[PDB]
Symmetry: D2
Subunit: 295 residues, 4 copies
């Protein structure tokens, strides 16, 4: 037998960094969870018990903290690029570094209407993420995403005109609840290396902001014909607003809310126009996905 | 043998309710998870296979939705009281109803700076909860709480002067991170029944708001001597601001963030005054609890 | 205000211990998660920032590992007793120690039909637990339990003869699925202190074994009239087999499996006697509880 | 813009099936969670609100239950193939079906040493899974796996001889704990369609059994030089025992157990040869992956 593919490293590395402004007293915190997996001339660790080719995953962990100490950890696209570039440059025989970063929210508290200098709240489990693949000889591929953005609209969602055959029981509807957990990913043009990534640093926060804003506004304003149609509009707009993005991907569950017929109880009317109480369904759920690119 | 205690019912009942203002088009949503457990003359269901004394848990589920259809679901203290009162009044032989409600956040979205009439965001996994125990002959006991409120302050937390003996390795500190998940509970004076609960309806949202506000402000402003001392201040203030509360309980984990000594690497300084990168510890964690009452 | 109740300490302390038999080469592992919360003359830590009365939770963590190093960690009832007794004896001003222990399964692997000397498998997420409350002047109260024991029987479960009124839609059934996650707790006679606990050491593993055996056999053999009736039988038997137990508590969810009517599709028959495919319901679920004592 | 990729359907479809032997009274249960995502000429649902091309995900759910009613649900490789083949054959314009199945354990209980005819225990959260991609014109690609198989060996694991530089703090060790959650995947030769899958039905349970057996035996018997080296041996053997498998993939976390130096306390010796009490680390963890193919 032979090794067709291999990568190894340290996952679930929790990192916090604080920035203190000496002059203002304002402190800023960042918290993330980091995974770094390396590829290279490491097949003999698997086939021959040759650990000489292994950069220990414990050392990869140390390196993550040292890199956070010596560089900015924001935007996560830049940090991941610095981190991955380090491994392929430091170790001749390592030829790719795969860096995934989950950024956790720490939003400054407002106390009595004034931003507090050093207290924060996790104002959502929504995440901002990056996947940075640093490949020697082939630059840096970055996928940026937002995930865990949980939303609901109580009307202005429809689903009718779908295929109807002997497997179909679903009633057409012109007014339903739509609720989802948004997973949205924008894939950047390949970057030739760390300098090119750095040359675009401002665009990373800007594009994340645009993607979120477009997601929320389209979700709220689209009188939705379906999840499919709504998510395409989101993707289309994001592409139109950042030329350095090549594709936009959405992965959306349809978290169903079912009407409850109560007419069996004293003729209570709770369906159609009289629907007020619904049963949220934990499972199953629709799952709808789209990758949109430039025509 | 004999039954010393018994209660039974339906847990994890997910409920959504929408309120539509016909005139404005503004819709408002509520989502909760409900548990109702009943007590009464039901020992024979356990000892004699006598199911005649059982109100089926499926029927308790139906009753939850019907009650939500026919009454306000807010404040959760009132809904739980209505619900529990129904079971003990409807069924002679049922003498207590234990209603736990978890309220989930659905905060109206602001789109282009204007509140949207029917789109919402889950802007936190923080919960507002109630535990309502309706006991025939003995009124209604309500415990209200907030939970899952996750906060961090990056300085103005201290821990020194603790007991030091042969089991102690912890260094005293005058400047550390403090991060916790706030679980705060306020226990109301017994209410004689549903009318008395209704007579106090406005106080339920007001007291929840006060508890949150006092929690966040004390957390942010107290140069903390310890979790113990900070949480007591929170509780003291809440008691001072609502005379219908008898006790205030806090349950707080201390979610440790550890310094990382990196001086082994090129003499890097990352401790004490130079501490910038920390390792959040998932476990273990301190757990600190207090119940505060009136002197 | 004033402190009405207080306890504090370290939660989620993961502990592993290995026992190596030098002579046989057979190794045995134990893994648990420990929480120790202390009570005593500690009110001033909360009201006066007096940390002198605080045994740091970090030191409580150290003490957990030291105690595991110097004593047996099995049965967990004994370990918890040793641990809690240490705190109230070591610290004059500490008057109670509350020790919760979750034991994780590490079952020796059989390889080619022979037990392996040092490899183990987690052959279930089922837990064996103890709650040991050590109260100065008042001995040691122990609650032992098994939890997370997930079972299903595909027939020989019934539910009929329950109360029927205007809230009832549930059909009576003479043949249904019953599936639950067993949480079973046996509460021991108070022990006067550590010597008395030690005098009963063998009974702890024996009683845990009996409780599990009786649970599984009753579940499998009882043509169940209801969860209520079945769980009472379990409790009755356990009480009859260990006189040092005062009560037996069960907490059982009824994890419903619903029939699926498919006759709308080509007259397919999948209900009643023809029921083969069912939909497991994640929520809601019945929750049925009983505490049984001696008449 | 334009749709570069799209797939949609129903996730988290829980399914139970019972088989009753009329003659013996022996019943057998299967429980799984199913996801079916379809691809085809569906771009206009996204770009033009054309729902005519959508097979509703609700109908895909119905179809899952109907297929389970009318066919065997075991081995999961065959069920997934039947299910995916149905969609591409039934709907001209659907050209791929992606079926993921998670099988949940329901192992027959032994009561008083005899297998019970209709009671089962979930004797592990370990899963048996399939990923079946049915592509019109291109047959059926199946990946089979086991996951969630959690194991520990308390000695006969080593890690030394790794790369040492300025980022390295890890001590070499000749005797450590190794614990992991096994994720192992075997990828089958492409099948031309449903007949070819059926022609190999017996091999699916046999190969799953071999993979598990080889995993457990190698884990227990290999005096491991590293995770890398041990997992390669597992993969090598599995490939040697089933020629219809093209590759074998492992994904293994190294769930670290750290020594605890206690010599600061009364010179207690708990390291090296005296190590008995360890601290399991929840995070971070190494993550080691390998795909092995035929040379
Ligand atoms: O938006 C929707 N898209 C779908 O494909 C679908 N199928 N059922 N309900 C649905 N709703
Ligand atoms: O605030 C704190 N309280 C405690 O009791 C403690 N113990 N260790 N660290 C601590 N911090
Ligand atoms: O065993 C049961 N007990 C109950 O109380 C019940 N209620 N609905 N179904 C039930 N099944
Ligand atoms: O088996 C191991 N492999 C690795 O690559 C490694 N790195 N640190 N510890 C390790 N153990
Ligand atoms: Cl859907
Ligand atoms: Cl603490
Ligand atoms: Cl029930
Ligand atoms: Cl590792
Ligand atoms: Na390199
Ligand atoms: Na009553
Ligand atoms: Na004492
Ligand atoms: Na087709």
């Amino acid at each position: 037998s032979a090794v067709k593919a291999a990568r190894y490293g340290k996952d679930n590395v929790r990192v916090y960094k604080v920035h203190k402004d000496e002059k203002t007293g304002v402190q800023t915190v960042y918290e993330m969870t980091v995974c770094v997996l390396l590829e290279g001339e490491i097949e003999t660790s698997y086939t021959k018990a040759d650990n000489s080719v292994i950069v220990a995953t414990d050392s990869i962990k140390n390196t993550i903290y040292i890199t956070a100490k010596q560089n900015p950890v924001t935007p996560p696209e830049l940090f991941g690029s610095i981190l991955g570039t380090h491994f392929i440059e430091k170790y001749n025989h390592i030829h790719a570094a795969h860096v995934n970063i989950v950024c956790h929210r720490w939003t400054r508290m407002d106390i009595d209407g004034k931003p507090h200098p050093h207290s924060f709240i996790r104002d959502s489990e929504e995440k901002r993420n990056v996947q940075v693949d640093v490949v020697e000889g082939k630059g840096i591929d970055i996928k940026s995403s937002l995930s865990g953005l949980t939303v609901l609209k109580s009307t202005n969602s429809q689903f009718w005109g779908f295929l109807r055959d002997e497997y179909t029981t679903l009633k057409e509807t012109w007014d339903r609840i739509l609720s989802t957990d948004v997973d949205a990913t924008w894939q950047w043009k390949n970057f030739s290396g760390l300098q090119e990534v750095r040359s675009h640093v401002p665009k990373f926060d800007a594009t994340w902001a645009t993607a979120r804003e477009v997601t929320l506004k389209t979700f709220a304003e689209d009188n939705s014909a379906s999840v499919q149609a709504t998510m395409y509009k989101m993707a289309e707009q994001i592409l139109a607003r950042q030329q350095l993005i090549e594709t936009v991907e959405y992965s959306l569950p349809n978290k169903h809310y079912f009407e409850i017929d109560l007419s069996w109880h004293k003729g209570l009317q709770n369906t159609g126009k009289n629907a007020e109480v619904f049963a949220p369904q934990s499972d199953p759920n629709g799952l709808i996905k789209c990758t949109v690119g430039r025509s």
